[PDB]
Design a protein around this ligand. Structure first.
Ligand code: T7X
Ligand code: LBN
Ligand code: LBN
Ligand code: LBN
Ligand code: LBN
Ligand code: LBN
Ligand code: LBN
Ligand code: LBN
Ligand code: LBN
Ligand code: PSF
Ligand code: PSF
Ligand code: PSF
Ligand code: PSF
Ligand code: C14
Ligand code: C14
Ligand code: D12
Ligand code: CA
Ligand code: CA
Lengths: 377, 377
């Protein structure tokens, strides 16, 4: 049990190894205690609070900001400790904020949630060819897969969900009347280039990042300025890379069904994005659209490394807190879509979702066979 | 530094020693995840959301409850580990909730805060002799002083602050026109009977608890039913008692100033209560008054034991998170009272507060002399 509680602190609160500059890792909470009071003193005595509309906004911004300060002192930093552990306590701080925001939304009705969205943005109330298709969103979609494949470390897992989702969005665009997106948009442009190009780049880096000899000289020791610039910049890159093996030839029925649940919660988070944008009508350029995608993308990096650790390591015996929070967020967003999306379906079929369930297991079982046989040949 | 980071986890997250019934200390976070998802599914698909006020109220309640659930998984449990550490993680979660609520209030104006209070309770908008004086509030004050003296473990500190605060409240009742509370009420009945009896009982229980031989037989091992009942009931009592010595004959200027700051913040936490209750006019029977007092009293129990540990232990090098949160709460309440209390003073004097500052140091210096000389005689 000494290992069973120590192995959780390698998942939940990964510690910094080989600290040389100790100014960056010594707490100053009393100075943080003195900063918050003087910060709020300036805002409680000099800010003009004569308008009620801008008082609620700045109060919300301050609650979010000062919850990030509390998260630095009290929240776990995941299995990541670069560039600083505190930047991952502040990402876990936003996960809890977004989790509790969804808990609130389940208890409202559609007229209150729509009135809430219009408060955030009043403009929401009133609302060759292939080359032009590539926009700033296609760049984000390419780098989303180049980051997912960086952590999943599998062609079979990433192409299984790249293909199934694009097939689903092609099918789910039967309801959407106005868009004229032809099938090649999400079967040739997306599956091949935006996804496969992203998947290829992400899996190419994993080979590089995991075969690299991680030798980290201290910043003070380097004498040449170009080395100091190299060392300063290299702080924002991983200090080590885990060797990921989702499947084993002797993998049990528990492990095989732990990668099956992994690729259902993965695809659940893609139905959340599709329906939240459709139930609450906002354009893809709105910060509610790509601001949420960036935040969920930031959460995913420590969640994939904590679900993998729990699933495989036999001395873990607890699932990391960030993976727990990414579990409620992904499940609650579906309940939000079912509750408020009671109207945009009349006779629509869940059978495709049921059919998607089988075609995922069909591809995990084929993945195990293609790797069990791989040892033989 | 191995001790400098280990000594913080004896303050922040005190671990349970000698666990025999392991059902009470084995996490089930995935079962917690399933419970939260099913509960929110039931409340999202079954609750009638046709009234907005009830929707907002139930959303607030659910957010508080699920923040408590998050705190059970991700927040430190103080130096206390009885009856369960989770019941102190939840207290810390409530502390953070209140801290952020205070952060929000600084950015509103008085009309918005009054509207919020009226939303919380619409009834707030429209709003021999000694034997009759003793009410449930007097009983609560007596038990609060008993609990305080249970942790401070000092007649000098407790009597100093009791006397100073009673004098301050007697003085501050110069502004209060309607109340006819004569000086005897808060110079004899309060100082002697309620406060004095509480202090006496607290110090008697300190003497009993710190001289007790803490031997904890496992619940399963006891065979007699009365012994099992005693062991079950005894779980809600401290498993050990720290020997508290605020002053030493060789105590430096740092320690003396630390006790001075301790008592200054202690009296600030009473100015906060007085001025909050007077600025936001609600009766002492309203839950906003005694609920807040109960919550601050619950916070105080680990805050005192963490401030003492930081102040005296020389290997601590960090102040516990509950102490940090109590500090921000105590300072932010004062800032709130200053911001919204800009009107109920015209020519009133801070000199008494300044005079109170000297008469506290006068009584710390006299406390050290009365104990430095104590060794000689
Ligand atoms: C509030 C709910 C929790 C209850 C709190 C008080 C009740 C006590 C009576 C006992 C009930 C039986 C259950 C007891 C829970 C076991 C004890 C307990 O606190 O575990 C919680 C999770 O909590 C559930 O996963 C609890 C899930 C169990 C309930 C599942 C069924 C629900 C329907 C975590 O513990 P732990 O020491 O690893 O806690 C962590 C701590 O959270 C981190 O801050 C530390 O960094 C880390 O090292 C470690 O100390
Ligand atoms: C409407 C729909 C219609 C059709 C629906 C039909 C649905 C069909 C139903 C599908 C469900 C199938 C479930 C099968 C589960 C088998 C058990 C299993 O493998 O357990 C474990 C893994 O599993 C876990 O327990 C992991 C934690 C899970 C909870 C956190 C979620 C966070 C998600 C984050 C996802 C991130 C995604 C990121 C994407 C980029 C392994 O077994 P174990 O022995 O416990 O493990 C041994 C190791 N220890 C314990 C010794 C350490
Ligand atoms: C308007 C008014 C008008 C007139 C105003 C005038 C005001 C006049 C101004 C008075 C202020 C005087 C302050 C002097 C402080 C000297 C330094 C000192 O003693 O430091 C330390 C203690 O002090 C700390 O640092 C403790 C942490 C403080 C922050 C947490 C707050 C939570 C409160 C919770 C209170 C709970 C209350 C509960 C009540 C029931 C000790 O020195 P050190 O060497 O750091 O310690 C050695 C130990 N280590 C470091 C090795 C471990
Ligand atoms: C004044 C700020 C001084 C400061 O931060 O010094 C600190 C030292 O100070 C101490 O060690 C004692 C604390 C002195 C009292 C200030 C507490 C906060 C009160 C606010 C009142 C608001 C002011 C305006 C309203 C009146 C700095 O040292 P530190 O390393 O950050 O301190 C310890 C940090 N760890 C080790 C615990 C992590
Ligand atoms: C954090 C780690 C990255 C997370 C994902 C990247 C953002 C993403 O995919 O959303 C992108 C945001 O685009 C950006 O702002 C990307 C920013 C630069 C790349 C990073 C767009 O992702 P999307 O909403 O799926 O784009 C499809 C939208 N159309 C074209 C279908 C209308
Ligand atoms: C929070 C948890 C959820 C995560 C994302 C969830 C998805 C939601 C994400 C983003 C959408 C948020 C709404 C923005 C669109 C509304 C219209 C608009 O332009 O508003 C703009 C918002 O401009 C701002 O100032 C926004 C500030 C940030 C918002 C919260 C994220 C915290 C990140 C902290 C990161 C810290 C570091 C982290 C670790 C490194 C400007 O407003 P405006 O149009 O001029 O009108 C303003 C006045 N009213 C009308 C609004 C009253
Ligand atoms: C169903 C609940 C089963 C349950 O809690 O069993 C668990 C075992 O289960 C596992 O080990 C695998 C997890 C199975 C998948 C459920 C994850 C949550 C999905 C929700 C979908 C919502 C359902 C309705 C909507 C579809 C119970 O065992 P546990 O000890 O609590 O689990 C490990 C706990 N630690 C060790 C990590 C602390
Ligand atoms: C939690 C640990 C106890 C915290 C303090 C006890 C409550 C307290 O003092 O407020 C008490 C609540 O009374 C209770 O509800 C006490 C509950 C039983 C005793 C515990 C009353 O404390 P107070 O507001 O200071 O009472 C003075 C009010 N008058 C008489 C001046 C009008
Ligand atoms: C939270 C952080 C701050 C702490 C305290 C700060 C001080 C504030 C404290 C208490 C004051 C709260 C307001 C209550 C008075 C208003 C009028 C009234 O009677 O309201 C009642 C409130 O009844 C409830 O249901 C209250 C639920 C609890 C509230 C939060 C505390 C969480 C404790 C969790 C402890 C868990 C375990 C902890 C560890 C073991 C009933 O309402 P009503 O009159 O019928 O009208 C209802 C409808 N409207 C009008 C309200 C819309
Ligand atoms: C702005 C600073 C640029 C970078 C300046 C710089 O020299 O960084 C070095 C520091 C610490 O580096 P060490 O070599 O002491 O620890 C190394 C440790 N064992 C490890 O490899 O993890 O990095 C940070 O904390 C960066 C905080 C970034 C804050 C955003
Ligand atoms: C400004 C921030 C820039 C991004 C900062 C950055 O690169 O660090 C993020 C982490 C760093 O990994 P560690 O060395 O802390 O953990 C090591 C552990 N054994 C492991 O498996 O990595 O890696 C990623 O998630 C890389 C994907 C990008 C995620 C956004
Ligand atoms: C309702 C249960 C009544 C009490 C039933 C009972 O038998 O309690 C024993 C348990 C654990 O007691 P142990 O002897 O295993 O540990 C002892 C440990 N080393 C120590 O001394 O701290 O206490 C709780 O967790 C109580 C949780 C209360 C949850 C509110
Ligand atoms: C339902 C809850 C009932 C109250 C539960 C209860 O009595 O436990 C609270 C703690 C228990 O102390 P521990 O044994 O965990 O810590 C031991 C550590 N070395 C120490 O110094 O105590 O003690 C107090 O604060 C007592 C004051 C009352 C506080 C309200
Ligand atoms: C881990 C990454 C977290 C980043 C949070 C994303 C929030 C972006 C908000 C953008 C709002 C822009 C308003 C004009
Ligand atoms: C550590 C103790 C925490 C207790 C929280 C106190 C909150 C009480 C609220 C009572 C409201 C009653 C409304 C009728
Ligand atoms: C009209 C389209 C606007 C898209 C803005 C994208 C901003 C990307 C910021 C990325 C930060 C990491
Ligand atoms: Ca697509
Ligand atoms: Ca009084």
């Amino acid at each position: 049990d000494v290992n069973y509680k120590m192995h959780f602190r390698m998942i939940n609160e990964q510690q910094v190894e080989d600290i040389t500059i100790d100014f960056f890792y010594r707490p100053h909470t009393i100075t943080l205690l003195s900063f918050t009071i003087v910060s709020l003193m300036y805002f409680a005595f000099t800010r003009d609070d004569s308008v009620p509309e801008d008082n609620i906004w700045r109060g919300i911004l301050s609650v979010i900001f000062f919850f990030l300060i509390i998260s630095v002192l009290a929240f776990p930093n995941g299995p990541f400790t670069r560039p600083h552990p505190a930047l991952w306590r502040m990402v876990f701080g936003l996960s809890v904020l977004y989790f509790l925001f969804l808990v609130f939304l389940l208890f409202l009705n559609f007229e209150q949630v729509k009135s809430l969205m219009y408060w955030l943005d009043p403009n929401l109330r009133y609302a060759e060819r292939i080359i032009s298709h590539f926009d700033i969103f296609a760049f984000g979609h390419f780098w989303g897969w180049a980051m997912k494949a960086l952590l999943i470390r599998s062609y079979g897992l990433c192409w299984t969900i790249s293909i199934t989702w694009e097939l689903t969005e092609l099918f789910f665009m039967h309801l959407l009347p106005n868009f004229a997106e032809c099938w090649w948009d999400q079967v040739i442009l997306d599956i091949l280039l935006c996804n496969g190009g992203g998947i290829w780049l992400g899996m190419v880096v994993c080979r590089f990042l995991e075969m690299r000899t991680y030798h980290w000289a201290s910043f003070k020791d380097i004498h040449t300025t170009t080395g100091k610039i190299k060392r300063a910049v290299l702080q924002f890159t991983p200090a080590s890379w885990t060797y990921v093996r989702w499947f084993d030839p002797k993998s049990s029925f528990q492990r095989v069904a732990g990668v099956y649940l992994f690729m259902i919660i993965w695809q659940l988070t893609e139905l959340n994005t599709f329906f939240l944008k459709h139930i609450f009508v906002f354009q893809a350029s709105h910060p509610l659209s790509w601001g949420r995608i960036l935040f969920i993308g930031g959460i995913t990096a420590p969640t994939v490394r904590q679900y993998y650790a729990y699933l495989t390591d036999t001395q873990c015996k607890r699932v990391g807190t960030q993976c727990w929070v990414f579990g409620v967020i992904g499940f609650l967003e579906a309940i939000v879509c079912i509750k408020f999306g009671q109207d945009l379906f009349s006779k629509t079929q869940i059978l495709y979702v049921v059919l998607w369930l089988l075609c995922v297991a069909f591809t995990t079982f084929l993945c195990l066979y293609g790797m069990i046989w791989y040892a033989e040949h």
